[PDB]
Design a protein around this ligand. Sequence first.
Ligand SMILES: CCCCCCCCCCCCCCCCCC(=O)OC[C@H](COP(=O)(O)OCCN)OC(=O)CCCCCCCCCCCCCCCCC
Ligand SMILES: CCCCCCCCCCCCCCCCCC(=O)OC[C@H](COP(=O)(O)OCCN)OC(=O)CCCCCCCCCCCCCCCCC
Ligand code: SF4
Lengths: 308, 83, 90, 68, 171, 155, 72, 98
Amino acid sequence: MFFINILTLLVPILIAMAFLTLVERKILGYMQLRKGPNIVGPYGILQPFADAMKLFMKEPMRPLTTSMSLFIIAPTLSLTLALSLWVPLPMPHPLINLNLGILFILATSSLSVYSILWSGWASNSKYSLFGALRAVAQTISYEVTMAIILLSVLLMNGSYSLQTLITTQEHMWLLLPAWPMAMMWFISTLAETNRAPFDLTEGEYAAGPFALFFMAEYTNIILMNALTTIIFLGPLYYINLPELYSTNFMMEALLLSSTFLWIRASYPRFRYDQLMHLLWKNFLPLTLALCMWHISLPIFTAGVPPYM
Amino acid sequence: AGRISAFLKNAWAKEPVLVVSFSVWGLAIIMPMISPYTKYASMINKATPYNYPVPVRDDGNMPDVPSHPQDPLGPSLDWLKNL
Amino acid sequence: MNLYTVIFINILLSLTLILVAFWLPFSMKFFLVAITFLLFDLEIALLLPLPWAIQTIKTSTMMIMAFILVTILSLGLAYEWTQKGLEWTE
Amino acid sequence: MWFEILPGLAIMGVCLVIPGVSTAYIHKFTNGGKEKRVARVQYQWYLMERDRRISGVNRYYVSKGLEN
Amino acid sequence: MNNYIFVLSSLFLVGCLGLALKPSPIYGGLGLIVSGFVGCLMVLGFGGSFLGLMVFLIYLGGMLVVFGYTTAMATEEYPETWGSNWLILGFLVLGVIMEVFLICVLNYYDEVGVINLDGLGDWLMYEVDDVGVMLEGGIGVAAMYSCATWMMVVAGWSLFAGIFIIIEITR
Amino acid sequence: RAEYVVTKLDDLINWARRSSLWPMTFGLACCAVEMMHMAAPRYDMDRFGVVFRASPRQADVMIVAGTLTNKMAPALRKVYDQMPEPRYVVSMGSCANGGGYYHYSYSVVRGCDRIVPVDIYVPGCPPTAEALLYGILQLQRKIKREQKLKIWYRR
Amino acid sequence: TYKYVNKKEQESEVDMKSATDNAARILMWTELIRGLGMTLSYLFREPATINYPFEKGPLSPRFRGEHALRRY
Amino acid sequence: MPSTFFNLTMAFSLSLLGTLMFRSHLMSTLLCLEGMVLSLFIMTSVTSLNSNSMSSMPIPITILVFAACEAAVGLALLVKVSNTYGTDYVQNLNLLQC
Ligand SMILES: CCCCCCCCCCCCCCCCCC(=O)OC[C@H](COP(=O)(O)OCCN)OC(=O)CCCCCCCCCCCCCCCCC
Ligand SMILES: CCCCCCCCCCCCCCCCCC(=O)OC[C@H](COP(=O)(O)OCCN)OC(=O)CCCCCCCCCCCCCCCCC
Ligand code: SF4
């Protein structure tokens, strides 16, 4: 039964990424006063399969000055992490019920720098290494707030578990409080996923590797929006209606993933220096201040949460 | 008063983020002394029974300790409910 | 056993995809950034146990120590700022 | 018009709803019509092992009750 | 699964051996990463959830990351290192086999001493509160804030002063 | 017969390769504003599956748009070489078809068909985005009319 | 006749009102939600696209296309 | 416990051997030092968890902090050495012999 559960978890998220590609294209088109894909299949639902076939049918021109080891284990690692992140997620009951689950998320997210850096060091150049260093620095820098935000918001629920946030928001979202922490969390998800306006790394791989990188990217997108939904937009949980919880979670995650593309179409890009100034001069001060605020709140209020 | 208030308005216009950070810092360090609901935190975290209450011998001279959970000679945290 | 199974499955799937793929046919600024990130990640390490520390009785002490941590971290940040460590204008 | 992105939005929504209800149903099936008992500490693990030992069929979810 | 922790410790040994042998500052980083992964796994085997996940999130995500960063930006790979890499890979094989023979001799010389291969799966957990809550590792690592505040101030001061130290060294 | 399934396999491969055409837009001159107008709403390049502009390292088709000079030919050839097989080329305009209004000049290549092999020639100075789209669909059909697996089978 | 772009008619006021308005603009991300609204409005319009081989773009009796040699 | 501790000590010894035996680089020595750090962290955490002594868990945290600081200053020194000579080699530090 467990292998069946694993299949039910993995297959749909991959399908959902493959179709999130199409949703992005169509939304950007309609925002640009055009349609997008209409032909290959009814409304385009065959275009992702077409593209997958095309890529995987191309011929890989593997750079000659390179290392096959780091050439193969970079996208393998990326996809492995992007899939193993979806495991602990309570939807509402999790495939693997972990304590310290958000910490597992932090770590398995921070482990992608290794691939995004080995790819560059493998490609024998200096421009690719420059780009890789810069992207690594960006991702690293934003991991700091990605961590502190949770460190401060996990004091309204005294546990690092994801199955406690359901009862923590059994009456009210964690957005009304910490809406300044969300606005800083919703963005570090863009910069972490190198998503516009933070795409200074994609604005040098064969068909298969490029496809794996694409899959990892969009999977991480869906997952970050799912974390937002679970944490700051706690859906409904009636003990007998996991169906209800899952429906609401899906709706909110789709809202968020469409907001990402809304933004991509709406705004220009950033400049690496200004992108780093943003964090190190606007997000870290406010983050530390609100961290102290949220360490004091449960004290000068008698609302310090429990450890079950 | 005037000079410093003009400085604060200049800041409030130029770098509101720094102002907000410092003011939240101050609120954090100050409110826990104003609030009356502070003590209750230690009170509760003490009242939580993560261990077994090992009893003691009835050696005669101990009138202010009960012989049964349902006696009023011991502590009673009805203030938690009333909270 | 279950975590092991899931991660093994993911690794197998990734390697299978990447096999099918082939079988079908100096600036000190970045260093300073890394160092600052170290000095903040270790602070995260010292800051993570707050959900267990705020369950104690010595609240007047946890308040104090957490405030000390955050304050001196902010001061170190401000100094790295004043000394032009967050500029990028070579 | 804007109502042609739904053929994909709904596909993704169904694919994102499947995991949750699938896991819930499979839990209810493998654990005797009940949720999968969680063990955050050793006390719950002890209760679970004890239920398993008193079952007589080596399964923690076979509740016995007063009859025994 | 009696051989679980033994396999983990042996993989750690092989990783540190591939460190001792010095292929290059990048394959050394990969070896360090593997050894740290295995170290976390064995800590979790011994029950250190917080310790192991902290290793994950800080040692790897924070330390080996900047190691590889500084390596790429301030190191160059020279062509000679490849033949010597193969040579030291053979060296690593020989070392593995020597260690196996070492362990055999030590089992022959001390049955219940150095290593009790007969009692491998045993002597992992000695005692545990079965009905006990509040006995994880966070309960201890969070002592720092109530008892052992001295350690917290020490560490915070080290980190604080590291800023000034590094700015003065690089400058 | 194996012939049936082999025909179907080739048909599927060609469907994918023709429905996921990604262009490298080697746009040199006034035969590129028309490609932009073709990406624009009224023609929506992206509606058939042809992305607006991708990287020259993962592209399938290559649109040569405008006058190719003797100072620019080597870069175009290097791009063609870097591109991954199976790769197709489309020459948009008189300049790239035969040199056009500068055919008798000293700094012009009298046809991109001397530097790279071409599959579809679009005539015009400039050819409307409608004509460029017609040419790209002609390329789609040229792809749909391939028999790779058949020729490898009956070899 | 000339005009000025990016020049104010005179200095502004540092009043608490205007300072707080600018601080709201900064923190609450006000000037960006309007761009989001423009994109949403465009999402809720009709696109100018046409089925090409079935719907053709409009031309004029003066269009200069392919050549022809005529007769009487 | 005995077996894993024996192997951890053997690993520390191997990394110290690597430090005391240079191979023309310096990163390959800092990495051995960090391997030592890791082995000691693991041994300490394992003894803490074996003895159930929750009053000794801060020790791994402290040693990790201080090893991080040491590694940072070492990396800075290596960066200066490279900035000056061009390589993280050890035959270039042949000065001070006079
Ligand atoms: C060639 C390509 C190479 C690419 C490979 C990339 C793979 C990386 C995949 C991501 C890494 C995931 C990290 C896993 C850490 C697990 C942390 C965790 O939370 O597990 C702890 C688990 C539960 O414990 P706890 O939550 O504290 O409380 C339970 C009480 N009810 O209690 C446990 O300890 C469960 C047992 C531990 C299981 C962990 C196994 C993780 C997967 C192993 C990967 C093996 C890959 C090959 C070897 C790696 C290189 C040597
Ligand atoms: C009890 C009383 C006291 C309690 C304490 C708390 C009181 C409230 C404190 C106020 C909190 C303010 C909000 C916190 C975040 C503010 C961050 C910020 O202001 O960023 C500043 C930065 C611009 O700075 P700057 O360049 O200097 O401005 C131009 C100067 N003319 O701006 C930026 O660069 C941001 C870049 C944004 C680019 C992407 C925007 C996308 C927006 C999409 C919509 C997101 C909506 C949120 C989604 C929620 C997710 C569920
Ligand atoms: S053919 Fe005419 S329109 Fe096209 S590039 Fe040449 S001169 Fe310009």
